[PDB]
Amino acid sequence: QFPRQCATVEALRSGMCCPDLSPVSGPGTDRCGSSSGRGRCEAVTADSRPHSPQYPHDGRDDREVWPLRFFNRTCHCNGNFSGHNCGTCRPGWRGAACDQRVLIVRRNLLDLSKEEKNHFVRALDMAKRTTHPLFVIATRRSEEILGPDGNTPQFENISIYNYFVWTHYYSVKKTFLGVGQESFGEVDFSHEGPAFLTWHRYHLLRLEKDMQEMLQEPSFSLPYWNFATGKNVCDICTDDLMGSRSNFDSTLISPNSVFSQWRVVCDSLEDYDTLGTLCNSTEDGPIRRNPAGNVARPMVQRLPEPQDVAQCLEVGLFDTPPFYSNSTNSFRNTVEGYSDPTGKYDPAVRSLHNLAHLFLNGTGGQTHLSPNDPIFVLLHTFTDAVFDEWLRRYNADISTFPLENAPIGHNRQYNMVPFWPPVTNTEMFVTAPDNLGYTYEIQWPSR
Ligand SMILES: *[C@@H]1O[C@H](CO[C@@H]2O[C@@H](C)[C@@H](O)[C@@H](O)[C@@H]2O)[C@@H](O[C@@H]2O[C@H](CO)[C@@H](O[C@@H]3O[C@H](CO[C@H]4O[C@H](CO)[C@@H](O)[C@H](O)[C@@H]4O)[C@@H](O)[C@H](O[C@H]4O[C@H](CO)[C@@H](O)[C@H](O)[C@@H]4O)[C@@H]3O)[C@H](O)[C@H]2NC(C)=O)[C@H](O)[C@H]1NC(C)=O
Ligand SMILES: *[C@@H]1O[C@H](CO)[C@@H](O[C@@H]2O[C@H](CO)[C@@H](O[C@@H]3O[C@H](CO[C@H]4O[C@H](CO)[C@@H](O)[C@H](O)[C@@H]4O)[C@@H](O)[C@H](O)[C@@H]3O)[C@H](O)[C@H]2NC(C)=O)[C@H](O)[C@H]1NC(C)=O
Ligand SMILES: *[C@@H]1O[C@H](CO)[C@@H](O[C@@H]2O[C@H](CO)[C@@H](O[C@@H]3O[C@H](CO)[C@@H](O)[C@H](O)[C@@H]3O)[C@H](O)[C@H]2NC(C)=O)[C@H](O)[C@H]1NC(C)=O
Ligand SMILES: *[C@@H]1O[C@H](CO[C@@H]2O[C@@H](C)[C@@H](O)[C@@H](O)[C@@H]2O)[C@@H](O[C@@H]2O[C@H](CO)[C@@H](O)[C@H](O)[C@H]2NC(C)=O)[C@H](O)[C@H]1NC(C)=O
Ligand SMILES: *[C@@H]1O[C@H](CO[C@@H]2O[C@@H](C)[C@@H](O)[C@@H](O)[C@@H]2O)[C@@H](O[C@@H]2O[C@H](CO)[C@@H](O)[C@H](O)[C@H]2NC(C)=O)[C@H](O)[C@H]1NC(C)=O
Ligand SMILES: *[C@@H]1O[C@H](CO)[C@@H](O)[C@H](O)[C@H]1NC(C)=O
Ligand SMILES: [Zn+2]
Ligand SMILES: [Zn+2]
Ligand SMILES: [Zn+2]
Ligand SMILES: [Zn+2]
Ligand SMILES: [Zn+2]
């Protein structure tokens, strides 16, 4: 989850992740672009406030108070600069002085031209195969991060797209259970709590930026899938888009799609939970997808109705106690899909976002794997657009987003795990057009 240049013995020893930008006088000369005034190496701010109760709780999880288990100093950027070394710009700005406004437009995948559809599928396929230029991932927990001989960092290179899968995995995986140790209650830093929407928004912003850099196309934008159609089919499961069903195995993707060649990451839960390792960059096994084919669970065999979206946008409180999968009259819990579209909780219901995932009946609907299916991108940009419209309706009213006692990872000033550099739920809780450099071309149902 860290810049390559800080995944070292010295950097972990110093507790500093403050890489050079333009070090002309030898190493360590231009930390955070300080020599041009772009930023400075400073102490990190991490959320101190208490999280909702956990039984048991020994507090040894590396994700608590992220990222202080690893680094306590980072680059704090000035003005409109940003990035791990202050070498780029805040979203909505570009140029060497980061003084030129930019606005990109996220569009319905089906409204794209034939040529733009092909461009998008080629870009995703390239992200799947190209090494992330900046980040490396840990294969081991903190206490074993330097290897058996105490001098070998257990980090691996990873593709742009696989890094997107890994960060989601790391946010949901179980805290490691030794011998004789009673099983902990489950935690989730990115679902089942108010950080659901701010977490997934940043996730997307980072993938978009990585792909813009990979293509050298500053204007590249992620499109969205309008899943609120009521349909009994996936209307983007064609061989020019996300891939139709294989005629040889109805849970596989058509071999006339590039996505039939993708192999998934993070699918060895049993090894992670027994050996106490983390997901590494080795791929293993194809995407499984089978839209509408969950015969056991019939409620999951049709997609959300258009009016499900108009209804959830009436729910006027962002979230409500106890800030969890059983909140009621919570906009967040409604869009996430644990409560019906009017606001009303009910443990049997699956709506909106959760329904879209479960409809896929495969890789796309297991929480540790789901981003391995690229439909995840398009389902999350749609979910984000609903979030953005709610932010516009209700003047970005953050007041019900709890400062304390939310499930771990979900307090308002938590650094969303495991993103780098540190970034709070607060920073994503803004209207995108004016604050984050992007808008959606979309029409809402008028009820
Ligand atoms: C910011 O980070 C600095 C730590 O760097 C890493 O990054 C953070 C994020 C964590 O991951 C951290 O674990 C990493 O090390 C941090 O400075 C570091 O602070 C630690 C904790 O105080 C220092 O270690 C302690 O040093 C004292 C005194 O130094 C002696 O060193 C040797 C012995 O090894 C001999 O020369 C003498 O005995 C010296 O007196 C030790 O007494 C102490 O040992 C005891 O505590 C540890 C656990 O803390 C036990 O395991 C031992 O058994 C002992 O009971 C520690 O080893 C470390 O030197 C220091 N590093 C540097 C480079 O300065 C800084 O404090 C953080 N800043 C803030 C604001 O938190
Ligand atoms: C995608 O959809 C598939 C079909 O809906 C999902 O598979 C089904 O998942 C359910 C829920 O876990 C399984 O239910 C269990 O069934 C066993 C009994 O097993 C046998 O059931 C029938 C006979 O009744 C038999 O024909 C099957 O071959 C099984 O051997 C119960 O004892 C358990 O308590 C539990 O209810 C189904 O078995 C399973 N069905 C099939 C056809 O596999 C699949 O999980 C979905 N995948 C994803 C990722 O969403
Ligand atoms: C990266 O992650 C993969 C997935 O966890 C690792 O591969 C897996 O490693 C385990 C443990 O070494 C293998 O299990 C063992 O297999 C032997 C031989 O069949 C068996 O006798 C043992 O009882 C044990 O179960 C597992 O098969 C293997 N799976 C795959 C896909 O190869 C891999 O080692 C990780 N890499 C690093 C650098 O940690
Ligand atoms: C992990 O990757 C680094 C960096 O790779 C470079 O940048 C990537 C984004 C991609 O573009 C690669 O094709 C690039 O090569 C590798 O770094 C090289 O490592 C060797 C020795 O390990 C060193 O001699 C080279 O000079 C390094 N180059 C740079 C730019 O740092 C590294 O090897 C990879 N690690 C493993 C285990 O494969
Ligand atoms: C809603 O469900 C919770 C479920 O338990 C916890 O909820 C979150 C805090 C989550 O982050 C996890 O730690 C847990 O799964 C119910 O919590 C219970 O609350 C009662 C009353 O306050 C308490 O005595 C219980 O011990 C809690 N449960 C556990 C597992 O300890 C909560 O009551 C539910 N509320 C509604 C309105 O249904
Ligand atoms: C930088 O960008 C923000 C984002 O909208 C803008 O509001 C602000 O006025 C800008 N300030 C500077 C330092 O130019
Ligand atoms: Zn804790
Ligand atoms: Zn998710
Ligand atoms: Zn291009
Ligand atoms: Zn209908
Ligand atoms: Zn999701």
Brief characterization of the structure:
The chain is of the alpha+beta class and 447 residues long.
Question: Helices and strands in order, then pairings?
Answer:
Elements: E1 2-3, H1 9-14, E2 16-17, E3 39-43, E4 73-77, E5 81-82, E6 88-89, E7 93-94, E8 100-101, E9 104-106, H2 114-129, E10 135-138, E11 155-156, H3 160-172, H4 195-215, H5 269-275, H6 306-312, H7 331-336, H8 352-359, H9 375-393, H10 425-428, H11 432-435, E12 438-440
Parallel strand pairs: 2-4, 9-12
Antiparallel strand pairs: 1-10, 3-4, 5-6, 7-8, 10-11
Bound molecules: a molecule of 6 linked components (NAG-NAG-BMA-MAN-MAN-FUC), a molecule of 4 linked components (NAG-NAG-BMA-MAN), a molecule of 3 linked components (NAG-NAG-BMA), a molecule of 3 linked components (NAG-NAG-FUC) (2 copies), 2-acetamido-2-deoxy-beta-D-glucopyranose (NAG) and zinc ion (5 copies).
The site of one zinc ion has 3 residues, from α8.
Describe this entry's structure for a reader.
This protein has helices at 9-14, 114-129, 160-172, 195-215, 269-275, 306-312, 331-336, 352-359, 375-393, 425-428, 432-435, and strands at residues 2-3, 16-17, 39-43, 73-77, 81-82, 88-89, 93-94, 100-101, 104-106, 135-138, 155-156, 438-440. It has a single domain (2-181, 192-440), classed as Orthogonal Bundle (di-copper center containing domain from catechol oxidase). The chain has a three-stranded antiparallel beta sheet with strand order 1-10-11, with no helix packed on it. With 447 residues, the chain is α+β, with helices and mostly antiparallel strands. The protein is built from eleven helices and twelve strands. The protein is globular and about 60 Å long. A hairpin with a 5-residue loop joins strand 5 and strand 6 (88-89). One zinc ion is lined by residues 353, 357, 380.
